[PDB]
């Protein structure tokens, strides 16, 4: 509803196509946050 840019368009097309299902990704504010912490001299990451 706020931030998943690829996810909110999919949500709209799923509500329209009769399928009340979400495919949530990472909120874009968190990517803004990881890019703003990395613009300080700090290496923040996502591990797997």
């Amino acid at each position: 509803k706020s931030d998943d840019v690829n996810g909110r368009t999919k949500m709209y097309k799923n509500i329209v196509d009769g399928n009340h299902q979400m495919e949530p990704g990472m909120p874009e504010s968190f990517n803004v946050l990881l890019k703003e912490i990395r613009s300080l001299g700090i290496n923040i990451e996502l591990e797997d």
């Binding site: 706020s2 329209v16 504010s29 946050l33 703003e36 990395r38 613009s39 923040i44 591990e47």
Partner: protein
């Protein structure tokens, strides 16, 4: 996708690996054509194309060739969205210190180099040199030098040694240092150091160095040689429509950095003098430090509005930073908002939703149902149809909202009932219609309140709105288990008016065939709603097997209670309506129905109660006129009597008999007595003015006055307001709190004159300003509690523990404040509760104490039940469902997955706006019993307590205590131990103003070193008849008897030294200074009489209790159990020593003797007994008396604040916060483990490490638990995302970076930040799957 977030320092290689090119020029864009300029801050070649699949020369324009690096301009042909992801970099011409690792205290560069921050700031501001390598020279490695000292060293030593200045020097020092060698050297000189301060400095430095060697970090990465450049779509330069541009402050700061950097490269090429290049390096350092954190070092840079530029650190921290403003809460689609109105026709699960709000909130649903049903051929056709609002889209809209809940929310959402789901009923207004019964949950009145509506989109969201949050599931409160969907002012007044009785009412005395005939008579106007009547009532009771058995009986009733019986569900008794139903009686009706019958009958009963209360309040015509406020006709003469009395106290002041202080106090008390007289006369006139005729005889009944009917219902108001309407409104305070000596002798029915009205505004505006300024304090307390407790989820069914707190009723002095019932209701027992007659278990060991079991506990007289608590739960990383107890909102044992910490924090901080800003006489019959006793008999027949903490309870004939008093040391007790008393009589008396020392055993005087003139000053006075003596002060003694303390001891006339029975150590009385003795040498005093005398709340209180802050002058508690003695003196601190004979005796304390000490040198003490008196510090309670002791202390001291304002909160919620407070431990013995002595570890970590060590035979570490405040415990979590998100983002992020930390997203905030399912609730199964399939 990913399971953890690792933070670390960024190597210059890492900074050059992120970047897609170097920003060489400060150009943002071209001014004529707004295309971005090459090698600039906005560079399409570096940061990606400015349009989708189009290079900036336009030579390549379609995704036929995507991913193509154009040759005419170097722009890739790809999406423009990559400008939000692609970073750049700046090659700094000089190494520049990172401001976060230089200035956020403690300085990491300073802590690492063992160098003060003033020295480092002088080296890197080019004010001093530093010797980066000594060589064969007397110059050491951290030796700073001035300019001329460096010149002298160059004279004496030449080019052998190496010394530098600036951040190049600091970088050479961080680079040249060896970390493992210096770490082991510091461990050596920590093993050989006993100075505790140096040991603290050494252990923090050692943890820093070992945190560097365990992570991949290198120290010199704290000095920036490459600087990252944020992607240009995150610091955008966007054209406003008016032709002007709008930029972020980051472009100004980056442009400053690049200008100073290119100028530094210029100066280094021109071979400028050292003054200019030093000044330029300083300017580049301060420009980079203003880019990273503006204002952290000195003056903030302000550009072109004379407002400080927002730096990179300001983007991510604070109430306006990313973490709190965009990541924990965010603007949300599918959300509307409007004013709320009543809609009393609704059912409990329904809201009224405007058609024009629901047509916008559900737009894609309507588009899809128009496409599906064939009514629109396209989504463009459906959009046009919804836009024109045809008649068919309203049928579609009725279809799409049918079983689709919406969430209604009234901000501030103080607790979880501030968001509830409802099924929408389409109304034609523009205002939401909020059901009346839920208003008290929202704290919503219809005087302009707005509420937001949110649409749950997915099937999971709809099913949670329907199953978890729907208002029919929410009829109990989660703070206390009481109903919160509860009738209110109009409803309560209707049900009260219906259920009352009048004496000679119309239709009195007839006999009815049931409730239906009563309704027939009332509607036919053949009988009034209050006519006392005889109704045949059939009532059902749930039998022991579980079904409903009937009984039919003629009940003496009124017509209105007969009518109301028609809506009462079946399993309830007739005694539930056969009374005038006030607010509490209706709430008890609903609670009884919920416990007996369940939720589904209770929601029906609640709606029916609301309908019938509204209906019969409408039929009531209940109206407030001006004659309803009857002023008592005794008001004028009571006020004239009080005026005469204050005139006589005024002439007693004019004649000097009384001072103005006692005059003021007596005038205040004889005005408050007159106020209470006026209030009593008013209420006695107002409650019973109905005298009416039964068969001719007049007969008084309860008044049908409307003001009294509203107050007595509990509908609106209390006698505190009726007293201001019809009584007088009494003494008002000044703005400082001192009450004005003349009261408002008027009320609001009469007028207040100009002076009385101004005097009342004094206190009115004080109340308004405190209301407007304490919401910002209660919200901050709630925030701190949420961020300490968020990660506590019920994760188990049982930890199998046997610990638990001993719940007892709260007896403050003479009266009980909370019984055992509301304290143990819902807990599980920790041990077998057994009857006072032993050997038969009343309640078994592990039983949940629901209402039947509590009824069993009050049938018998058990008064202390050991229950299980979350502070004693063996579950690590969570809480078992048995140690919590009941889920107060549902009424059963709590489910696995409940997020109890957020519920506890909301339940504590929701009532925050309701907070602000000598001898004992036994009251009733009982058998007294004293504990902590050391007792003798006096010369006269009293009972004398030679014990400090002896406490006198009143054990009744059943065993339970009904009052508990504190009897001081040496108080004479008129009765024995176990003697019955009379109601209102005195049992113990003592001297309030002085502390007596009492005779241990009968004996004779010995003045041992009681030297006259050196330790004794003789005093004389006439009205005593006998001269007195004083043992001397510290500041009145000559040299002498302060070092040899004067003592008075016991001997016999035999000459034999008679001593304590049982021991042969010399009995003494070491009389301290400021004492009185009127007894001469050799006098005979028996055991039991004195020998000498010695003279002596609100919301901030809750906030201070939870922050665990030490009070001003705390009680000095005895550390270990031993005997008292004394050492050195008069250094400002007398030297106490407590020696146990049965071990290593000496434990010495440094008590400053300006504190009145509360123990003598002869007696034995235990851990926790107050050596001095004062407000206890909770750290001392946790340390000496235990975990359950500080738990009991905190819950009692918090509930004391919450019970003054009449706020019910279950103790589970404070025990959750207490568990989260005592969450760390300190290692005292490292054991066979990987910890260090004196380091603070997570308590669950050390517990499970000890468990896995003991499993392999090796003995584990031993620890001491710590009590942190809610802020210091929120900030000390093992998850840096939660701590950096809470507050002090900069400190948390630097600690986490230099520690090379890792955050596994285990709590709730780290999964809300990254947009995942929370590990609590319906996302708990998902995380169990995720951690059982990402583990194996």
């Amino acid at each position: 996708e990913f399971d953890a977030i690792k933070i670390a320092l960024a190597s210059p290689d890492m900074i050059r690996s992120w970047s897609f090119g170097e920003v060489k020029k400060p150009e943002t864009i071209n001014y004529r054509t707004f295309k971005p300029e090459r090698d600039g801050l906005f560079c399409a070649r570096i940061f990606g194309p400015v349009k989708d699949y189009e290079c900036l020369c336009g030579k390549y324009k379609r995704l036929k060739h995507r991913g193509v690096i154009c040759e005419k301009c170097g722009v890739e042909v790809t999406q423009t969205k990559v400008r939000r992801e692609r970073m750049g970099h700046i090659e700094l011409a000089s190494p520049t210190a990172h401001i976060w690792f230089l200035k956020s205290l403690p300085s990491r560069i300073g802590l690492l180099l063992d160098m003060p921050l003033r020295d480092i700031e002088r080296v890197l501001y080019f004010e001093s040199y530093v010797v980066i390598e000594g060589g064969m020279t007397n110059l050491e490695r951290q030796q700073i030098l001035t300019e001329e000292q460096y010149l002298d060293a160059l004279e004496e030593f030449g080019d052998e040694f190496d010394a530098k200045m600036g951040a190049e020097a600091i970088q050479a020092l961080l680079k040249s240092m060896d970390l493992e060698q210096e770490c082991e050297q510091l461990r050596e000189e920590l093993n050989e150091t006993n100075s505790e301060t140096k040991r603290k400095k050494l252990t923090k430095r050692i943890k820093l160095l070992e945190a560097f060697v365990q992570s991949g970090n290198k120290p010199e990465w704290m000095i920036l040689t490459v600087l990252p450049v944020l992607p240009p779509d995150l610091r955008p330069l966007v054209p406003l429509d008016g032709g002007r541009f709008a930029t972020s402050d980051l472009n100004d700061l980056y442009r400053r950095v690049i200008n100073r950097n290119n100028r530094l490269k210029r100066l280094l090429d021109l071979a400028a003098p050292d003054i200019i290049v030093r000044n330029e390096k300083r300017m580049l350092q301060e420009a980079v430090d203003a880019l990273l954190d503006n204002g952290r070092r000195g003056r903030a840079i302000t550009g072109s509005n004379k407002r400080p530029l927002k730096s990179l650190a300001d983007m991510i921290k604070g109430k306006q930073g990313r973490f709190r403003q965009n990541l924990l809460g965010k603007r949300v689609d599918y959300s509307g908002r409007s004013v709320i109105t009543v809609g009393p026709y609704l059912r409990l699960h329904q809201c009224g939703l405007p058609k024009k709000m629901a047509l916008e909130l559900f737009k894609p649903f309507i588009y899809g149902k128009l496409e599906l049903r064939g009514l629109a051929t396209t989504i463009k056709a459906a959009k046009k149809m919804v836009e024109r609002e045809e008649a068919v889209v309203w049928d579609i809209l009725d279809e799409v909202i049918r079983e689709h809940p919406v969430l209604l929310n009234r901000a501030p959402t103080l607790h979880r009932l501030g968001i509830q789901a409802f099924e929408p009923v389409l109304i034609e207004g523009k205002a939401i219609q909020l059901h009346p019964l839920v208003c008290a949950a929202y704290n919503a009145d219809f005087d302009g309140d707005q509420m937001a509506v949110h649409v749950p989109l997915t099937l999971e969201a709809q099913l949670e709105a329907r199953a978890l949050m729907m208002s029919t599931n929410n009829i109990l409160s989660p703070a206390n288990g009481e109903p919160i969907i509860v009738p209110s002012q109009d409803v309560v007044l209707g049900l009260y008016y219906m259920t009352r009785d009048c004496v000679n009412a119309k239709g009195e005395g007839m006999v009815l065939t049931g409730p239906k005939e009563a309704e027939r008579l009332y509607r036919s106007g053949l009988a009034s709603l209050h006519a006392r009547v005889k109704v045949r009532i059939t009532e059902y009771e749930k039998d022991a097997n579980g079904e409903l058995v009937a009984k039919t009986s003629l009940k003496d009733t009124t017509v209105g209670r007969a009518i109301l019986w028609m809506i009462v569900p079946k399993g309830l008794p007739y005694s539930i309506v056969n009374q005038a139903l006030g607010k509490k009686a209706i709430s008890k009706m609903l609670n009884t129905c919920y416990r007996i019958l369940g939720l589904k009958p209770t929601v029906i009963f609640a709606d029916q109660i609301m309908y019938t209360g509204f209906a019969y309040a409408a039929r009531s015509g209940a109206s407030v006129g001006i004659d309803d406020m009857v002023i008592p006709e005794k008001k004028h003469e009571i006020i004239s009597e009080a005026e005469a009395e204050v005139a006589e106290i005024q002439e007693q002041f004019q004649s000097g008999l009384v001072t103005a202080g006692e005059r003021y106090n007596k005038v205040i008390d004889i005005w408050a007595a007159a106020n209470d007289r006026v209030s009593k006369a008013m209420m006695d006139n107002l409650q019973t003015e109905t005298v009416i005729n039964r068969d001719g005889q007049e007969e008084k009944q309860v008044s049908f006055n409307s003001i009294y009917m509203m107050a007595d219902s509990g509908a609106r108001g209390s006698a505190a307001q009726i007293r201001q309407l019809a009584g007088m409104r009494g003494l008002m305070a000044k703005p400082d709190g001192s009450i004005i000596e003349t009261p408002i002798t008027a009320n609001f029915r009469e007028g207040l004159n100009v002076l009385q009205y101004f005097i009342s505004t004094h206190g009115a505006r004080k109340g308004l300003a405190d209301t407007a300024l304490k919401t910002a304090n209660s919200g901050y307390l709630t925030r701190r509690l949420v961020d300490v407790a968020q990660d506590l989820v019920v994760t188990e069914d049982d930890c199998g523990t046997h610990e638990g707190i001993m719940m007892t009723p709260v007896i403050e002095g003479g009266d009980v404040k909370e019984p055992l019932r509301d304290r143990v209701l819902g807990r599980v027992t920790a041990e077998d509760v057994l009857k006072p007659g032993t050997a038969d278990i009343l309640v078994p060991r592990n039983t949940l104490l629901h209402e039947q079991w509590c009824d069993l506990l009050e049938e018998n007289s058990v008064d202390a039940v050991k229950v299980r608590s979350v502070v004693s739960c063996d579950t690590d990383f969570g809480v078992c469902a048995h140690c919590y107890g009941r889920d107060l909102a549902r009424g059963h044992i709590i489910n696995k997955g409940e997020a109890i910490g957020v519920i506890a924090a909301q339940s504590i901080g929701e009532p925050g706006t309701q907070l602000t800003m000598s001898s004992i006489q036994v009251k009733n019959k009982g058998s007294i019993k004293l504990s902590n006793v050391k007792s003798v008999v006096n010369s006269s027949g009293k009972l004398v307590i030679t014990s400090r903490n002896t406490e006198l309870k009143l054990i009744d004939e059943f065993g339970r205590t009904k009052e508990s008093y504190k009897v001081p040391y040496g108080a004479v007790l008129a009765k024995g131990d176990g003697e019955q008393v009379a109601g209102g009589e005195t049992v113990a008396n003592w001297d309030p103003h002085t502390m007596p020392v009492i005779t241990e055993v009968s004996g004779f005087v010995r003045f041992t070193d009681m030297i006259d003139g050196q330790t004794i000053t003789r005093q004389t006075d006439e009205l005593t008849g006998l001269s007195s003596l004083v043992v001397l002060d510290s500041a009145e003694r000559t040299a002498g008897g302060k070092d040899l303390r004067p003592a008075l001891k016991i001997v016999d006339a035999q000459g034999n030294d008679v001593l304590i029975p049982g021991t042969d150590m010399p009995a003494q009385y070491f009389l301290p200074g400021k004492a009185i003795v009127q007894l001469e040498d050799g006098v005979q005093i028996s055991s039991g009489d004195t020998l000498a005398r010695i003279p002596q709340g609100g919301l901030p209180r809750v906030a201070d209790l939870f922050e665990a802050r030490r009070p001003k002058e705390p009680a000095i508690l005895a550390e270990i159990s031993g005997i008292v003695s004394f050492g050195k003196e008069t250094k400002g601190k007398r030297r106490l020593v407590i020696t146990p004979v049965d071990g290593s005796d000496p434990y010495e304390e440094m008590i400053p003797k300006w504190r009145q000490l509360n123990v003598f040198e002869g007696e034995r003490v235990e851990r926790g007994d107050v050596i001095s008196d004062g407000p206890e510090a909770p750290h001392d309670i946790l340390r000496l008396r235990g975990v359950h002791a500080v738990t009991r202390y905190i819950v009692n001291e918090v509930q004391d604040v919450y019970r003054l304002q009449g706020v019910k909160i279950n103790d589970k919620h404070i025990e959750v916060i207490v568990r989260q407070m005592l969450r760390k431990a300190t290692i005292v013995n490292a054991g066979s483990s990987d910890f260090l002595e004196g380091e603070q570890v997570e308590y669950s970590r050390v517990k499970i490490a000890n468990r896995e060590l003991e499993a392999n035979g090796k003995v584990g570490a031993t620890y001491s638990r710590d009590l942190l405040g809610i802020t210091k415990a929120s900030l000390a979590t093992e998850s840096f995302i939660s701590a950096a998100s809470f507050q002090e983002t900069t400190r948390v992020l630097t600690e986490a970076a230099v520690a090379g930390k890792r955050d596994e997203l285990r709590g709730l905030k780290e999964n809300v930040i990254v947009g995942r399912l929370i590990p609590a609730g319906t996302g708990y199964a998902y995380h169990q799957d995720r951690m059982r399939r990402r583990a194996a």
